[PDB]
Amino acid sequence: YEPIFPVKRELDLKKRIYQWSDGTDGYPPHLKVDGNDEANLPADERQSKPGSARSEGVGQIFDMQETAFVSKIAQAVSFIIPKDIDHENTPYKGPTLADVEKFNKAQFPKKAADIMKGRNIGEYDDWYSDARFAQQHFSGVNPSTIETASQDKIKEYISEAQKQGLDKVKAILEDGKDILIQDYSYFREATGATNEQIFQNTVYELKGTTPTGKTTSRYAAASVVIFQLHEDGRLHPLAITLDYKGSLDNSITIFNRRLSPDDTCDIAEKEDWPWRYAKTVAQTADWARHEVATHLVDTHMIEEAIIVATNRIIPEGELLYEILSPHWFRTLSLNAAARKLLVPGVIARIAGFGPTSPSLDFKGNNAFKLIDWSYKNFNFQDKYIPNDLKKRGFDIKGDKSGKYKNYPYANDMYLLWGIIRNFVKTVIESQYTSDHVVQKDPYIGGWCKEIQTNGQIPTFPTITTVEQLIDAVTMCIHTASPQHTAVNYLQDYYYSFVPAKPPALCTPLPQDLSALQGYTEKDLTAALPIGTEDMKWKDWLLAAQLPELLSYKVQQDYNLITYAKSLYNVNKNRTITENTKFNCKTIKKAAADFYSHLKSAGVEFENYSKGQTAGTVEYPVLQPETTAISILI
Ligand SMILES: [Fe+2]
Numbered sequence: 001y002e003p004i005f006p007v008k009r010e011l012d013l014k015k016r017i018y019q020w021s022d023g024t025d026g027y028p029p030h031l032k033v034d035g036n037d038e039a040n041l042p043a044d045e046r047q048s049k050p051g052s053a054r055s056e057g058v059g060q061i062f063d064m065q066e067t068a069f070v071s072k073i074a075q076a077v078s079f080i081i082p083k084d085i086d087h088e089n090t091p092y093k094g095p096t097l098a099d100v101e102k103f104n105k106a107q108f109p110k111k112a113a114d115i116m117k118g119r120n121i122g123e124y125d126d127w128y129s130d131a132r133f134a135q136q137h138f139s140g141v142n143p144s145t146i147e148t149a150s151q152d153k154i155k156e157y158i159s160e161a162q163k164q165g166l167d168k169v170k171a172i173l174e175d176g177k178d179i180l181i182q183d184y185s186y187f188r189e190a191t192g193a194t195n196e197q198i199f200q201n202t203v204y205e206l207k208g209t210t211p212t213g214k215t216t217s218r219y220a221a222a223s224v225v226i227f228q229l230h231e232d233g234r235l236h237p238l239a240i241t242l243d244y245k246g247s248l249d250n251s252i253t254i255f256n257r258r259l260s261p262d263d264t265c266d267i268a269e270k271e272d273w274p275w276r277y278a279k280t281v282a283q284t285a286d287w288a289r290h291e292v293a294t295h296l297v298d299t300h301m302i303e304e305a306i307i308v309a310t311n312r313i314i315p316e317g318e319l320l321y322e323i324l325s326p327h328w329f330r331t332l333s334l335n336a337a338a339r340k341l342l343v344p345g346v347i348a349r350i351a352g353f354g355p356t357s358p359s360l361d362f363k364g365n366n367a368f369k370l371i372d373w374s375y376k377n378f379n380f381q382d383k384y385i386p387n388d389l390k391k392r393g394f395d396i397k398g399d400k401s402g403k404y405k406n407y408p409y410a411n412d413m414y415l416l417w418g419i420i421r422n423f424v425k426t427v428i429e430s431q432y433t434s435d436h437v438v439q440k441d442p443y444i445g446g447w448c449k450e451i452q453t454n455g456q457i458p459t460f461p462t463i464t465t466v467e468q469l470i471d472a473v474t475m476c477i478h479t480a481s482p483q484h485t486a487v488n489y490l491q492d493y494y495y496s497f498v499p500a501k502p503p504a505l506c507t508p509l510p511q512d513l514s515a516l517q518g519y520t521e522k523d524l525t526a527a528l529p530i531g532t533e534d535m536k537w538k539d540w541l542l543a544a545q546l547p548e549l550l551s552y553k554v555q556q557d558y559n560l561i562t563y564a565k566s567l568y569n570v571n572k573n574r575t576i577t578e579n580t581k582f583n584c585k586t587i588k589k590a591a592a593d594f595y596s597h598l599k600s601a602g603v604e605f606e607n608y609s610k611g612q613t614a615g616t617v618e619y620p621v622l623q624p625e626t627t628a629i630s631i632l633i
Pocket of ligand 1: 300488550633
């Protein structure tokens with residue numbers, strides 16, 4: 001008969017089922033899906049009704065009703081709100097901030113049921129405040145990109161401070177008492193736009209398929225926020241560059257009229273319309289870097305690359321496949337729905353990068369140029385939590401000062417990284433006993449080469465040592481589960497109230513410093529998507545509904561805990577400690593530990609949360625009970 005080679009037959013089959021994209025769609029490498037149509041996914045990785053065997057599907061990922069609703073908004077291309085979606089009162093109707101804030105609180109119940117259960121930052125009256133704004137850079141949806149300010153970047157702000165004759169603010173930077181930066185000036189470099197070109201998205205009105213002359217513009221800014229970190233451990237915003245353009249000579253850079261959190265000035269924080277605008281512009285900058293870079297690229301897309309490469313090279317039954325496999329549950333169908341609807345029909349629509357909405361060529365669209373560049377400029381090893389916290393300038397290993405008490409991400413993760421490495425170290429070493437044993441493995445070398453080339457993650461290691469294999473496996477797990485968890489499952493809260501953190505601006509920037517300095521509420525109210533005017537209704541809905549959709553809380557069984565308890569691979573409907581091949585006494589002992597380590601950690605993440613400055617919003621996101629096995633939303 002014809003000769004049968006079980007392995008090479010199975011891999012030949014997987015390399016047909018799991019194929020790469022040619023990249024003509026304008027996305028980083030992913031699983032090839034003809035027109036991203038559900039049907040053209042691999043049979044098992046498709047979607048069934050909720051309460052089904054895993055050989056059928058993965059259960060309805062999103063909330064049926066709020067998908068049909070969000071799809072309704074994306075499809076709605078008419079500038080006149082459709083009869084269906086329209087209501088007597090809406091959270092964008094206003095027409096004032098007061099009226100919009102007043103609506104928000106009246107939608108808190110006792111339907112909207114996530115990890116904050118229908119609640120948002122709108123609960124806090126003083127969300128505008130310097131503490132709550134800045135606190136989002138430690139505890140918000142993007143806690144992982146703030147870093148120590150380069151000495152020669154302080155040198156710029158020392159100069160601009162002097163230029164404005166602000167003698168007080170100069171002395172603060174002069175010495176350099178824990179001066180930190182959050183830098184979105186890279187958006188230009190990232191989109192190939194010149195320093196004379198402004199970010200503008202021209203939203204063309206269509207009569208279904210055919211356009212009418214009518215348009216409305218949304219705007220975006222390569223902002224740069226400068227913070228000082230005090231000893232009591234409060235992150236204080238000092239300065240915002242609204243849109244950085246090579247130098248601060250060519251940009252308009254405002255300074256906080258209160259130079260500390262306790263500072264008192266006769267103009268309040270609520271009435272400081274110049275500063276409340278700047279912060280709102282700096283919020284659009286972080287919305288982008290969060291959704292594109294920190295969320296979509298760094299988690300969803302990096303994980304898909306691993307999934308595809310791992311499936312193509314490493315066979316089902318191999319140890320590496322079995323530890324990684326569970327952390328992929330339903331990731332592929334979700335990215336196929338992101339690439340189809342969410343990225344083009346929402347992200348690229350509500351963002352201010354443009355150049356147009358809708359787009360006919362995504363390779364020409366800037367949101368896609370940013371998606372592409374974010375993937376290209378990711379670094380697999382540098383975002384190892386230890387290496388992450390080190391290079392960004394955070395010594396969590398030994399801070400006696402207690403200055404990082406307001407930074408629970410940095411606290412929670414430094415612990416949680418070692419714990420997941422502990423687990424992997426025990427399981428990997430149960431087969432991979434030496435650097436040599438790794439070197440003489442068939443798949444690990446080709447696994448790396450596949451990821452470094454086709455996956456287009458060159459920063460992925462050439463795995464020689466046992467430590468190198470452990471960190472790589474930790475990272476795949478860390479990215480897929482707790483890192484995605486942190487950045488995914490606080491969207492509803494921080495985005496639901498659109499003014500707190502809006503996706504883009506609905507009016508051009510102020511022309512110069514002198515113009516901004518005399519800004520009224522109506523300017524911000526206009527800049528935000530409020531009123532029946534200029535299709536601002538659609539921008540609000542999408543801005544506050546995508547968060548609620550993607551914040552929809554994880555099911556009990558898709559916990560990191562429930563896995564650590566029983567090692568049950570939800571994704572593959574099997575258990576690793578039922579493969580007589582592997583040294584299972586060890587694996588059961590690693591899992592037994594890993595579980596006791598996580599229960600123990602949930603206690604510490606709690607302490608870190610309540611250990612923050614009085615009033616500071618909680619950080620419950622990395623609670624193992626509320627952490628996802630995979631990138632499953
Ligand atoms: Fe996500």
